[PDB]
Amino acid sequence: MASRILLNNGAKMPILGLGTWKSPPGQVTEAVKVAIDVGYRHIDCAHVYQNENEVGVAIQEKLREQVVKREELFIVSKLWCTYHEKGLVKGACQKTLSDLKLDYLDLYLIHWPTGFKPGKEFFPLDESGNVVPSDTNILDTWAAMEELVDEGLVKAIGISNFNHLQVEMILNKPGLKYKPAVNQIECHPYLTQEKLIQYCQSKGIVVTAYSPLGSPDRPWAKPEDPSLLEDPRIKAIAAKHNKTTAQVLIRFPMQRNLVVIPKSVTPERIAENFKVFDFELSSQDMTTLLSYNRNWRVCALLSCTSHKDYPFHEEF
Numbered sequence: 046m047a048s049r050i051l052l053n054n055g056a057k058m059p060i061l062g063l064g065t066w067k068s069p070p071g072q073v074t075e076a077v078k079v080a081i082d083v084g085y086r087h088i089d090c091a092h093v094y095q096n097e098n099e100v101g102v103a104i105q106e107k108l109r110e111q112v113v114k115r116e117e118l119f120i121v122s123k124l125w126c127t128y129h130e131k132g133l134v135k136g137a138c139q140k141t142l143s144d145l146k147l148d149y150l151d152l153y154l155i156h157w158p159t160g161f162k163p164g165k166e167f168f169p170l171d172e173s174g175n176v177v178p179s180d181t182n183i184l185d186t187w188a189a190m191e192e193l194v195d196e197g198l199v200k201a202i203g204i205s206n207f208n209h210l211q212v213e214m215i216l217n218k219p220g221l222k223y224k225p226a227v228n229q230i231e232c233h234p235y236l237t238q239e240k241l242i243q244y245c246q247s248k249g250i251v252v253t254a255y256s257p258l259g260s261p262d263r264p265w266a267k268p269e270d271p272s273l274l275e276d277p278r279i280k281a282i283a284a285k286h287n288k289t290t291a292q293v294l295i296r297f298p299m300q301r302n303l304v305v306i307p308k309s310v311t312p313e314r315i316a317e318n319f320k321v322f323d324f325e326l327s328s329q330d331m332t333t334l335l336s337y338n339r340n341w342r343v344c345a346l347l348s349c350t351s352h353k354d355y356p357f358h359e360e361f
């Protein structure tokens with residue numbers, strides 16, 4: 046299987062990338078350096094992760110060392126919810142560019158479909174704990190994203206955590222100039238996303254699977270939640286293939302024509318996670334993994350559920 050997938054902007058995107066949410070700032074520079082050394086060419090970033098400066102130090106050092114050329118890297122970031130406004134989008138993108146020490150992004154995503162009140166706080170709340178919305182809509186935010194392409198700041202634009210109706214809304218936007226290249230969504234054997242993936246793929250939108258290992262380090266994890274990495278059924282498939290459970294969990298989305306972005310700051314795991322291009326899951330393995338769906342989401346947040354554009358009320 047090829048290492049890159051063709052996007053609807055004509056560029057190629059590496060199907061394996063390194064995730065950076067929760068990567069501590071004192072560890073992420075080395076994580077990214079190691080990743081690039083062992084073959085990663087795609088890094089998934091976001092302003093809200095608060096570590097783009099440190100990710101950027103690594104990228105810049107590897108460019109300076111001439112380990113890789115800029116054209117060989119595929120750097121992704123995301124517009125946070127408090128920047129949905131027309132007058133804030135460019136500056137948000139530019140802050141990310143400055144922190145990452147880049148002149149352009151390969152892909153810039155609307156991080157969540159919901160706009161929040163601008164200000165210093167990433168999750169502005171009212172006194173009762175509800176997020177404070179902005180009156181911005183996804184269509185006007187999309188127009189602002191299109192401007193970034195036309196100014197040369199980003200090569201591609203896309204969306205993240207958009208449900209099927211929201212993707213459709215963008216595709217049906219009056220005067221749409223650029224289709225979204227990517228929808229980045231949670232996807233793993235406990236949240237298999239068959240409906241949304243089929244819709245997006247049918248429209249030529251590439252899907253990126255986040256939290257492919259079930260995000261065991263998510264800060265809201267409870268001791269009782271299901272655990273992909275410990276699931277004996279998945280362990281059995283891994284054992285049959287002489288691979289680790291994580292390697293199976295990474296190969297799974299790859300064979301569905303998805304991009305996948307496992308996170309690690311452990312050098313041995315960063316390397317392990319990349320060694321997924323030399324084995325194949327059978328069709329029976331794939332269907333078996335799909336059968337584990339339980340509609341379980343890592344990524345959801347009670348404080349945001351009443352926002353008009355919160356994505357997880359719809360079935361898909």
Ligand SMILES: NC(=O)c1ccc[n+]([C@@H]2O[C@H](COP(=O)([O-])OP(=O)(O)OC[C@H]3O[C@@H](n4cnc5c(N)ncnc54)[C@H](OP(=O)(O)O)[C@@H]3O)[C@@H](O)[C@H]2O)c1
Binds near residue numbers: 063066156257
């Ligand atoms: N667009 C969005 O809204 C959104 C939401 C969530 C995530 N994402 C992106 O997707 C990325 C991945 O998702 P995620 O960070 O939620 O979780 P994940 O990649 O599913 O899991 C990361 C966890 O798995 C551990 N791990 C990694 N490789 C392992 C291996 N080979 N064996 C055992 N454990 C391993 C990591 O530990 P160590 O790091 O300690 O090694 C870390 O605790 C994020 O970092 C972010 O870039 C985007």
Ligand SMILES: O=C(O)COc1cc(Cl)ccc1C(=O)NCc1ccc(Br)cc1
Binds near residue numbers: 094159344346
């Ligand atoms: O959104 C992500 O990429 C990962 O999740 C988070 C990352 C940070 Cl740095 C801070 C908060 C979250 C989080 O709570 N995500 C869940 C969520 C769900 C719906 C909306 Br709208 C916003 C966040």
